[PDB]
DNA sequence: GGAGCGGATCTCGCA
DNA sequence: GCTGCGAGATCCGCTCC
DNA sequence: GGAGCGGATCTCGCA
DNA sequence: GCTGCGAGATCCGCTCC
């Protein structure tokens, strides 16, 4: 369930092979009719998918084209993290499997409307991406657009000046206080609590103000 | 209200959206959207079978 | 700076970007990006401070056109005559408020003269004269003149003269025409000058060639000293060098380098 | 509210374009179009989500090119031949991938037909067919064609499939290329779409 | 902030107009042929083309007091005030700039041969060789001020994000329901911190079990 | 109850009755009849 | 409603009226054979009455 | 733990030590092939350590 | 610790680990250059121990 | 007291 | 050195007119 | 604060 | 003129010593 995380899978529908990509966070889907399951076709489709929008990670299962020599080289060339699920565990890629149902059920309705199968695929993409408007009233494409817009790093790089403070904290095991463990840089200061990154465990922890003290500022 | 009802009906005919989508888009009542979606012959034909279960004697 | 040079090089090898794009993306100095782009064999086989000059007339009056390749900045001013002296006056008055580095122009009676080349030699800005046979240049030059001349009649009736509309055209083009996040072309130029000024602070102390040795770290094993290798650019404890064997740029800390006297 | 009178006064004084007024005052797009139409000088003589469609020949290869006027976003595909069915499929896929609102093209056999016109009315997008009058679309599409063919010539030997080279050129010209304040021709489109969404949500 | 001034000088039976800036120190020179108001108007609009002012102050002039002139300056939207300045700082700056430019131009006489070339070359030398503070040209400090004001005006964009997020927890070895929606407090690499409503306690949750949603109406 | 809405509207135009009678004789929901009679300028202005 | 033959479900048939509504299953009237049938809740599709 | 071949699960093997405990699956050490394997939670049987 | 250049002090450079406490000056380790430096006592601000 | 309405709850089938 | 999922129906308990 | 403990919750596979 | 089911694991929240 990552932000730029995509799951890809094949499916069959009445002597037709469809390749489906599903975005984990927003729920946006992208389906394409493919003649076969060869490595070259998958490479072309996946680099077109990268061209349309920039992902960061991919999840897939074992397959003749998902795992090979050329495809791994292509993914390294593009710079996409690739993860392979446990064999004989189709439940691993649950999201794409559920989108298979949600795609077939809707595509059953639009077949009579259009003579061309690709037209039906585009229509079901319309009705499942833009015209869904589910939940609070935002289509998945809107969520994807917002997430892509807020991902800009230049906004984060606009300001380079910020106050820096350090803190003293101790662990809390079974209600028993421990000992102060070095000075730590404050990550974010709210009300009634604070966040500290423990280097020994390399993990983020939350400490109440009763177990937090502040060093005097430089003077 | 009444004026945009044909617009919502034709939009659902063209795209076969959901009742919640129609209510959030055209501002029609949820009951009206439910009536529109339930009256679609295509939607009724391809709808999933009902899921009600009982218990033994 | 030093660290991300190989990343920019490999990205350009993958996609064949341009120097301006590399500078804006990876933050490398413009000189480094230009060097990387120029050394590309495929590219060998459009930039800031690069302008083009064309001649045009309207209502029997002399006007000069200055089109910037990147920032899309247009400048104009009334010219009394097409003679060499008046042409030089306008050309160096153009440098009075601007600091370019390259310029291109066609062949003209006032372009070539015994005193024209020596005058620009003192300025030091490189200028190239040639025939613009590129279809891209032909189609790009055409649209600029139409764009600047269309705005002329939109404000003639309440301005007294044509030289009054001269400033109105610049107001219409360089001030109000905005793209991106509401960015004017003059805003683009001013922002470009900001990152253009940065490299002076580094090149001020780098104007003296040095030879130094470099040592390659492999799994924590220093190995040996290798060199000599020319120092490309300086950094805060990082130095980039060229590898003779692998033909790749390497980054080394300041603790694995010595000074070789000249 | 006062932004509308301010934009009206500024257009009276200078006669700028609608996109600049929308970007610099945040006025509604409909109001900007109304102001533009109400100018007799402009009428008698660069829109968001405005697209241009063209064909390209590449040493027997047919390429369909879609160019966004406001943002330099290019969508290129390979077409077997100039046919109404293929054009309808391609345009429906294009509407599937983006959220356009208007389209401009020339007078062509597949472009002008009862079937395609009915389909585009079905989608709900304004269509304008004829000789362009604004001296900006022709130059922009010429630059797009020139850059696209140059990049295709550059990147063809690296990959095997022609569609692979086309995808690589789209990557180079849509994401990797940058300009202005370090912005890409694809991030600008996302920003414009987000602004349109938030304005529509705020209004209705 | 963005204050401008005008002053004329007479040399060799010729008139030179000088544009002066107070906060930064921009200096511009031009040769005024006649005293007609048309030359002043075209010079002012050329200056408006090459510069973006906000406030301008100047003394009285024979052509300045004219209904057409005020109408044009209001068409441009710039502001202007009448009356002789009483600020000693402005007078001192104007006098120093004028004496410096006169000294530089009289020192540079033998190098040139023409006149307009001479004026523009003097403009180049005055606008380039003037190193103030950390070796900053007046145009350099002007562009510094412009970029500083632009970045301080555009810095509000990065602050108005307030994005919303969902979250879930692991209970008895199985994932829980998607609790939310809610507003994220601080989001760093690996995990984000959020406020919980069930127990009114802060909870840190990794990125592998969250969803990102724009804020509702 | 959507198919008879235009017919009910034209009947209202012919007769100009009140919302309760329309709801009780046509099966239309009460809210729809209230909005219909609200849209009626003649019925709205004489209240 | 649909009828299962040898486990494989058949094509959907109807629409028909629910003669008797039961929690586990329902009873429907067939036109082809003029005989009563009992159909479980997993092979039914409730729809509003047509007009 | 057990290994699935062509979908059909194999005979149970072990007992072995849980080298790395994960929520979705675990990593175990094999004696026959001296190789590491990842086994999903649906093919494991937790037992107390023998003595 | 703050650095001095011809009588002009620098900034505190953030907290750093101490090495040894001498008389009149102390020795510290720089993180940017991994170089050991010496700083006078008057230019060093002591961090009080936890209370 | 009529009224609609937001949300918890149910099964089943993608592989 | 990792992983189940949600769309499409149905009522309760609610509050508001 | 340590301690065990009753009970809600989970999946999967009979046909 | 009728129907899904529970055994076997695992923690939380509890209170009592
Ligand atoms: Ca599958
Ligand atoms: Ca049995
Ligand atoms: Zn429908
Ligand atoms: Zn190159
Ligand atoms: Zn106009
Ligand atoms: Zn009425």
Residue numbers in the entry:
A (entry chain A): 58 to 276
B (entry chain I): 1 to 57
C (entry chain C): 1 to 45, 58 to 274
D (entry chain B): 2 to 46, 58 to 216
E (entry chain D): 60 to 276
F (entry chain M): 1 to 47
G (entry chain N), H (entry chain F), I (entry chain H): 226 to 276
Tell me what the authors wrote about this structure, in their words:
A multimer of retroviral integrase (IN) synapses viral DNA ends within a stable intasome nucleoprotein complex for integration into a host cell genome. Reconstitution of the intasome from the maedi-visna virus (MVV), an ovine lentivirus, revealed a large assembly containing sixteen IN subunits. Retroviral integrase (IN), the enzyme responsible for this process, catalyzes two consecutive reactions: (i) 3′-processing, during which IN hydrolyses 2–3 nucleotides at the vDNA ends to liberate 3′-hydroxyls attached to invariant CA dinucleotides, and (ii) strand transfer, wherein IN utilizes the 3′-hydroxyls to cleave the chromosomal DNA, simultaneously joining the 3′ vDNA ends to target DNA (tDNA) strands. The amino-terminal domain (NTD) consists of a compact three-helical bundle stabilized by coordination of a Zn2+ ion; the catalytic core domain (CCD) features the RNaseH fold and harbors the invariant D,D-35-E catalytic triad; and the carboxy-terminal domain (CTD) adopts an SH3-like beta-barrel structure (reviewed in Jaskolski et al.).
Here, we describe high-resolution structures of the MVV intasome in two functional states: (i) prior to engagement of tDNA and (ii) following strand transfer. We collected single-particle cryo-EM data on the MVV intasome assembled in the form of the CSC and purified under conditions used in our previous study. The reconstruction was refined to an overall resolution of 3.4 Å. In agreement with the previously reported MVV CSC structure, which was refined to ~5 Å resolution, the present reconstruction lacked features consistent with LEDGF/p75. The CSC and STC structures recapitulated the MVV intasome architecture harboring sixteen IN subunits in a tetramer-of-tetramers arrangement. The CIC is formed from a pair of CCD dimers provided by IN tetramers I and II, plus a pair of synaptic CTDs derived from IN tetramers III and IV. Comparison of the CSC and STC structures confirmed that the intasome does not undergo extensive conformational changes upon tDNA binding and strand transfer. The CTDs from eight IN subunits form a pair of C2 symmetry-equivalent tetrads stabilizing the hexadecameric assembly via intra- and inter-tetramer CTD-CTD interactions as well as via contacts with vDNA. Importantly, the lentiviral intasomes share two unique features: intra-tetramer CTD-CTD contacts and an α-helical configuration of the CCD-CTD linkers. Using site-directed mutagenesis, we demonstrate that the hexadecameric assembly is essential for MVV IN strand transfer activity and virus infectivity.
